[PDB]
Design a protein around this ligand. Structure first.
Ligand SMILES: CC(=O)Nc1nnc(S(N)(=O)=O)s1
Ligand SMILES: [Hg+2]
Ligand SMILES: [Zn+2]
Length: 255
C-alpha cells in the first residue's frame, strides 16, 4: 500500500475492507456541528518522564519511538478512561504548504499533522490494545508554516541520517513537550488508524491550536524518501489519507 496513484488511499479497500467501515479516520471537523460537551474533562499529558529511543524511516513516515515498558509518558483525562502510554509519534505532511494534515477543520487543510500514539495500559501490550474499541488514543496536532518551532529542530537535524526506507538512528533524550501548543482545548470523536491496517480502535483527540513551524523545518521533511537505498528516488511527500464519512458519529468539543 502507499500513497501513489496505483497503491494510494482509494485502493486500500481491496486489501483492507475495513477502509469502508463505520468509524474510519480522518474526518472533517465541522466546527458548527460539533457539540460542546461540558462533562468532558481537561486532558492530562504527563510527559516529564519520557524516554525516546530511536527515529526510523519506515517507508511511509518517520517515527520517533519511546520506551513504553513503564508509565513514563502518559495521557489520561479528557474523554479517556484509564491511562494510555506513549509509544511513538510521526507526522503526515504535504508537497506544498496548503495540504498535509489528515484532519481538516471546516475543510481547511494544514501543512502537516503530528500524531502522538498512545495505547490503553489495561490491555497489557500494544498488540492487545489493537483488539479493543478503546485500545488507542492518538493526540493530533496541526502544524502551520510560520516561525520555527525550536523544539522540533533536533528531529529536523537527524533526518538526513534516516533518508531512505529501513534506516534508523538512536534518538535518546528528546522531550516531546516541546511540540505541544499552549492550549489543550480539543475535539474528540471515535475513529481508526489512518494507515493500513485501518483498525477502529482509536479515540481521537485533535487539538484546537496549531503549532507553527518554519518553511525550512517542513522542507527538511520533504527531502525524505519512500524508497529504500539504491532504489529510484520517490520523495516522501503527501503521505496523508483524505477525510472519510463521519457516518453518524458526533464530534464533541471541550470548549
Ligand atoms: C503502529 C501504529 O502506530 N500504527 C498506526 N497506524 N496508523 C496510525 S495513525 N496514522 O492513525 O496515527 S498509528
Ligand atoms: Hg479495535
Ligand atoms: Zn498518523
Amino acid at each position: 500500500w502507499g500513497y501513489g496513484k496505483h497503491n494510494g488511499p482509494e485502493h486500500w479497500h481491496k486489501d483492507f475492507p475495513i477502509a469502508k467501515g463505520e468509524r474510519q479516520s480522518p474526518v472533517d471537523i465541522d466546527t458548527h456541528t460539533a457539540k460542546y460537551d461540558p462533562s468532558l474533562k481537561p486532558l492530562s499529558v504527563s510527559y516529564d518522564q519520557a524516554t525516546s529511543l530511536r527515529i526510523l524511516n519506515n517507508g511511509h513516515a518517520f517515527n520517533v519511538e519511546f520506551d513504553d515498558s513503564q508509565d513514563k509518558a502518559v495521557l489520561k483525562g479528557g474523554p479517556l478512561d484509564g491511562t494510555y502510554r506513549l509509544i511513538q509519534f510521526h507526522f503526515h505532511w504535504g508537497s506544498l504548504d496548503g495540504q498535509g494534515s489528515e484532519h481538516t477543520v471546516d475543510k481547511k487543510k494544514y501543512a502537516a499533522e503530528l500524531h502522538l500514539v498512545h495505547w490503553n495500559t489495561k490491555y497489557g501490550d500494544f498488540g492487545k490494545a489493537v483488539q479493543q474499541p478503546d485500545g488507542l488514543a492518538v493526540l493530533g496536532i496541526f502544524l502551520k508554516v510560520g516561525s520555527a518551532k525550536p523544539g522540533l529542530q533536533k528531529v529536523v537535524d537527524v533526518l538526513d541520517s534516516i533518508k531512505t526506507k529501513g534506516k534508523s538512528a538512536d534518538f535518546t533524550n528528546f522531550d516531546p513537550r516541546g511540540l505541544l501548543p499552549e492550549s489543550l482545548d480539543y475535539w474528540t470523536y471515535p475513529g481508526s488508524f489512518t494507515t493500513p491496517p485501518l483498525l477502529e480502535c482509536v479515540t481521537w483527540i485533535v487539538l484546537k491550536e496549531p503549532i507553527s513551524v518554519s518553511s525550512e523545518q517542513v522542507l527538511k521533511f520533504r527531502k525524505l524518501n519512500f524508497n529504500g537505498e539504491g532504489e529510484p528516488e520517490e520523495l516522501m511527500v503527501d503521505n496523508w489519507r483524505p477525510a472519510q464519512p463521519l457516518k453518524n458519529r458526533q464530534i464533541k468539543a471541550s470548549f
